[PDB]
Amino acid sequence: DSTECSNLLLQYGSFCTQLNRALTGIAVEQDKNTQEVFAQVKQIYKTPPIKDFGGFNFSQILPDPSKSKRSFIEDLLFNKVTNGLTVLPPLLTDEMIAQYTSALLAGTITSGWTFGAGAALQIPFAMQMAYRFNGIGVTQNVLYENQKLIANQFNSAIGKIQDSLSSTASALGKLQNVVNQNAQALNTLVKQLSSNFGAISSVLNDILSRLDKVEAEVQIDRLITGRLQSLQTYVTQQLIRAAEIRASANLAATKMSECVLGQSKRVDFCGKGYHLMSFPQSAPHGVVFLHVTYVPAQEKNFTTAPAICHDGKAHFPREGVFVSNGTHWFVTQRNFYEPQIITTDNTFVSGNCDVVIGIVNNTVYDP
């Protein structure tokens, strides 16, 4: 706010204007990035008063009216993150962001993927999980026969996440680095006001009070040059950093469209194992996904053969693999051991026994 300096700053033309046009480009983009991720839902879905989701217990990630009305886990995520400069508010408040994570979650719980392709269609949650099992090649009878075990494995796994997020902050390092980088950059920009840049003092009122004008203008132009270079260094760094955050916001928007609104078959995209579903939770400066996956866990060895010989015909399985326990032969679904008797209706024919390497002799049953 020194006028004698501001008159010299006019000599430099449009530099102290295209800087503001660049930081304005950054500032709008942060609201756009936030809207690409969360605003994928057309209507604010809300959960029923009853909670009979087939034995699954979402109460730790659904909204809590005693909390904004965030979930239990969203409160952990909000707790574990911790000179002419102006910070500006985001367009969406944290109370709006928590309504979008609520709506996405209430849609996914009551209506599966259907709200991502039209109006939300209600479905019983045990039947929704049978569709998620078919999506990974495990036959839907496997869910209903094991539903109370599967519900308890899910309920148990959510409990471990609360304990992990309670016990250490070290998981949220990706979000805490954004906060630390923003603070570190602004402190560095302010610290550089104290530097001389070869001028007789870094305090502008010293120069103006101690020197005659023809000498003072030479000193002030060093401070102008140093401070302008120190501000251009900050703005250039912020443009490079904002492109990294945009590449992450595009990935997060894609993870939400594919993992939450559907069932992605892209390997390791929605966490390790075969993907079942995922749930969004909000956090400071970002988003958290709870990816739910099916992992097979107790293998046995079996003998196998690519085909079977009956009445000269070579038989192949329709949807499964032939296996033996050493004395008998069965056809089995590939992702979970459920042996079935080998019949004309589990199999199909092509040609005779001569061409196939490793074909074996067994009875194929006719119902």
Binding site: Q122, P124, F125
Partner: protein, 396 residues
Amino acid sequence: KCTLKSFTVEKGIYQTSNFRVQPTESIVRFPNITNLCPFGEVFNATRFASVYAWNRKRISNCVADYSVLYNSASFSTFKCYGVSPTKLNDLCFTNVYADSFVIRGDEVRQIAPGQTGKIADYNYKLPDDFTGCVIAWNSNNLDSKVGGNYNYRYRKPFERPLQSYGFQPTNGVGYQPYRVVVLSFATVCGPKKSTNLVKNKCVNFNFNGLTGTGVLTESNKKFLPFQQFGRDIADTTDAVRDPQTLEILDITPCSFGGVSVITPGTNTSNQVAVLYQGVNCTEVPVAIHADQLTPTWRVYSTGSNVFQTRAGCLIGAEHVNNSYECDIPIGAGICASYQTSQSIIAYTMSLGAENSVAYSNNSIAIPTNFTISVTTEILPVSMTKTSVDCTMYICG
């Protein structure tokens, strides 16, 4: 229009200016002034020694009362080699060399610093470079002997052409006997003035030579006894001790922020609203174009439904009770638009219609028809190509 360098404006919000509250007055504080230099210890002794041959010594490490010495008629005359005594009241030296002694006025007229004659050249040695003055009174009142000037020699400041002075006892210091003295040059510095101390207003300030502008406020920091300034993490001064009243004042920035203009395009209307980003509406009618500047500007400062938001003070836009989709964004969930008879309105934006999905453990909904739908998507692929001959851009 001048911001965009265009006569036609598309719909949006444009930052056009910065608002910055001005300092209302200036506050100056220095300690309760003490240990003034005893200039009377020179100038009250002016009858004593021989003015062509006396010794002289430094006055130093005590405050130069030259402001009072300029106003006070403490001698029959005074004159200076450097500036006037009012200008000397702003100066300093390691010491001022000084002496007091009487002489015949025909010689003593040469004893003003920078003057002609044998005094300023030798007997009262003081060129025009002497940072100070000489002053005198008629010695015929007491300093002269029964024979006049014969009690002393006549031609440093008032100190060693000297010979026994001939001035007769019947007359004043301009030719007959003068009782006289002189004094001229980090320690002999003039006193620093001070004002009252003002709180809770944007002021310019100076404490002990540390300077700034800000809102001074009462504060609860506990400095150690010898500490005088407080600093924030990023070097920034944020508290001071008043040297007259040893309590601590906090320094806070004078309020400032971006000014943005909210507009439907010039095709739709010339009505606008203005947002003072991060300002509190109480502070707004200050610094830039405000309540004074006619129906062409004061409409956007004084009235037209002034309204307060978490983004800043907003002027010219009507607050509305409904919610709608966000047309022009403002911040913290506020958006604005031009609507029906038509005006600019500001409202909390609407996330979408709310919907209870009719879930129960044995109900399913199945679609009985379809629509084919064609959706457009647009993607950029390539910039305009360019190359620049910097030899020609730089040197022409």
